[PDB]
Amino acid sequence: ACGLVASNLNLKPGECLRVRGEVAPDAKSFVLNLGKDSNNLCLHFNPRFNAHGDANTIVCNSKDGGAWGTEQREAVFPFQPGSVAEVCITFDQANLTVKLPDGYEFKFPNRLNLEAINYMAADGDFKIKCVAFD
Amino acid sequence: ACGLVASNLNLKPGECLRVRGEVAPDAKSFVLNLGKDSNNLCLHFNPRFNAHGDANTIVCNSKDGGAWGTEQREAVFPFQPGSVAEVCITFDQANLTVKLPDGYEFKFPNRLNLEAINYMAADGDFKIKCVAFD
Ligand SMILES: CO[C@@H]1O[C@H](CO)[C@H](O)[C@H](OC(=O)c2ccc(C)cc2)[C@@H]1OC(C)=O
Numbered sequence A, B: 001a002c003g004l005v006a007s008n009l010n011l012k013p014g015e016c017l018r019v020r021g022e023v024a025p026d027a028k029s030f031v032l033n034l035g036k037d038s039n040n041l042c043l044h045f046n047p048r049f050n051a052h053g054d055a056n057t058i059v060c061n062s063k064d065g066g067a068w069g070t071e072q073r074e075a076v077f078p079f080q081p082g083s084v085a086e087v088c089i090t091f092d093q094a095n096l097t098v099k100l101p102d103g104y105e106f107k108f109p110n111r112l113n114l115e116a117i118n119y120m121a122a123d124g125d126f127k128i129k130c131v132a133f134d
Helices: none
Strands: A005-011 A017-023 A030-037 A040-051 A054-064 A084-091 A095-099 A105-109 A117-124 A126-133 B005-011 B017-023 B030-037 B040-051 B054-064 B072-074 B083-091 B095-099 B105-109 B117-124 B126-133
Touching: A005 A126, A017 A030, A017 A117, A030 A126, A040 A084, A040 A095, A117 A126, B005 B126, B017 B030, B017 B117, B030 B126, B040 B083, B040 B095, B117 B126
Parallel strands: none
Antiparallel strands: A005 A117, A005 B005, A017 A084, A017 A126, A030 A040, A030 A117, A040 A054, A084 A095, A095 A105, A126 B126, B005 B117, B017 B083, B017 B126, B030 B040, B030 B117, B040 B054, B054 B072, B083 B095, B095 B105
């Protein structure tokens, strides 16, 4: 990850992680990775503007002991290149909930059954400006 | 260390790092470390409420290639246990400038001559709630 990497987050169920960043004006893609560590991700969150044969599609996946799971593709894309976006993430036993710009929301199963999020990494065309824990 | 650890900050000269956190009601001390990595710190910032013989004193130092430099104490102590505190940090070639609650500002010489600040770690009796880069 070229972007910010943070560990020892100690984010517990029902706590809200808010991340605000700048989307590059020539953005192709960006990634937010969340989990225990780099090899154990409960959420790989990958908005693709124009990358890997995908246009304006959010792709999500998990990684378990180094092995990627099966990707899920979402139905909404409320990001624009060249703009500031905020993403809010919370989790419980069964699901991660991601709240996006403009009132959009989706869920992704908690496949690792993690009880804390301790690692966050960003990559691609997204510059983090603010991180907050509520 | 036990607190938040962040890398790839890419904080450049003139940019502001703002960190806000909760100081435990029974706080003895907390640490914020900034630099390149855990062996190369341009600033080790250590408010002692009651620790290692010292009361209501800010200790600062650097660490270069694993070796602690010459420690310095500041006279002002604008922290209270059991409250929220924000510290703002910026640097240039000559100095770090640390702005504290209640308006107090001090400079600490930049002994490492780093191009950017890429590493931050918090430790002790301070829970990070928000970090911002501008
Ligand atoms: C001269 O002893 C050292 O002085 C140094 C400054 O010159 C450091 O402050 C160091 O403490 C620490 O690195 C540290 C780390 C974590 C926490 C919670 C507290 C202190 C240590 O102080 C002592 C006594 O450890």
